[PDB]
């Protein structure tokens, strides 16, 4: 862009070296797509995912989280709550991550959980479900490219997005981009309620308590630093409910944020301030 050119002009020296590694055939067509969504309140969100991840067994599911810390926490959580998953977070060896992705790519079933920015540069295989549990970092890229990789080369998989009842303006954005939507509802009685076991586990296990706190802080901070602040605003988020989703009775302390001129005051013209 012009701002990128301006930044390269102020930063780089007069003589640059311009290197082009980019595909020219970007298929960003706005009609051949179908994005499914499910409206779920915060305090039940993970529970719905857990129920989904226990009902869509014997299938291929990719789940996207906003942060690596929440991926690590949910990996340990699903290890204890007897649901087998595979994890791709940036605290492991690169070799471990490549072997795990290779094992997931050559399996009949199973689910892999990772970050959306971590799987942005990943050859996504044919999967039945692509689930966006957390808000997408790049909504345009998510919708177009992740929906195209979710539809697949063969029989059509589906791309589900988890929406709270305070981020529904995203649907209005999907109305403006002329993208067909599909609404998924769920019965309340078919949610596997493991909330009491989750809270007992968080209250008794020190490592899982630390991981839950780190994942909660990472989720809040990634939600705060969001490009679409109109759709995803931290100030509209109920912290008690989302901490209950993470498994807390009380929400741990986080920082959401992180007239007249003087009479007779003329602008400064000299002096040194450090």
């Amino acid at each position: 862009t012009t701002k990128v050119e301006d930044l390269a002009r102020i930063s780089l020296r007069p003589g640059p070296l311009y290197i082009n590694v980019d595909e020219e055939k970007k298929y960003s067509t706005v009609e051949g797509l179908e994005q499914g969504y499910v409206v779920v309140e915060a305090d039940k969100r993970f529970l719905l995912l857990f129920s989904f991840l226990k009902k869509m067994a014997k299938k291929k599911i990719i789940v996207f989280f906003s942060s690596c810390n929440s991926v690590k926490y949910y990996s340990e959580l699903l290890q204890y709550i007897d649901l087998p998953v595979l994890d791709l977070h940036g605290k492991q060896k690169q070799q471990k991550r490549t072997n795990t992705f290779f094992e997931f790519c050559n399996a009949k079933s199973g689910t892999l959980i990772c970050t959306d920015v971590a799987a942005r540069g990943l050859d996504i295989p044919q999967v039945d479900w692509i689930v966006q549990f957390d808000p997408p970092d790049d909504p345009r890229d998510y919708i177009h490219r992740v929906g195209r990789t979710a539809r697949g080369n063969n029989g059509k998989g589906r791309s589900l997005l988890f929406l709270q009842p305070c981020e529904l303006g995203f649907l209005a954005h999907l109305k403006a981009a002329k993208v067909p939507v599909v609404e998924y509802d769920f019965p309340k009685n078919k949610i596997l309620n493991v909330q009491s076991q989750l809270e007992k586990l968080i209250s008794t296990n020190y490592y899982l308590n630390q991981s839950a706190k780190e994942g909660y802080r990472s989720y809040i901070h990634a939600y705060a630093s969001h490009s679409l602040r109109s759709v995803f605003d931290v100030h509209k988020l109920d912290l008690v409910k989302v901490a209950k989703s993470f498994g807390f009775s009380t929400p741990p302390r986080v920082d959401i944020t992180l007239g007249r001129r003087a009479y007779g005051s003329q602008p400064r013209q000299g002096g040194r301030y450090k």
Binding site: G264, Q266, P267, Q269
Partner: protein, 38 residues
């Protein structure tokens, strides 16, 4: 009748230092480049 003067009070000397344009800031209009500070 004429008048004579008898001195009353303050005998004091004012060395000019600076004259600014603003109320207590603003650009410098006059600067005395002779002043030797105590």
């Amino acid at each position: 009748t004429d008048i004579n003067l008898i001195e009353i009070g303050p005998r004091f000397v004012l060395t000019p230092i600076i004259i600014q344009e603003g109320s207590f800031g603003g650009p410098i209009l006059y600067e005395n480049k002779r002043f030797i500070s105590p």
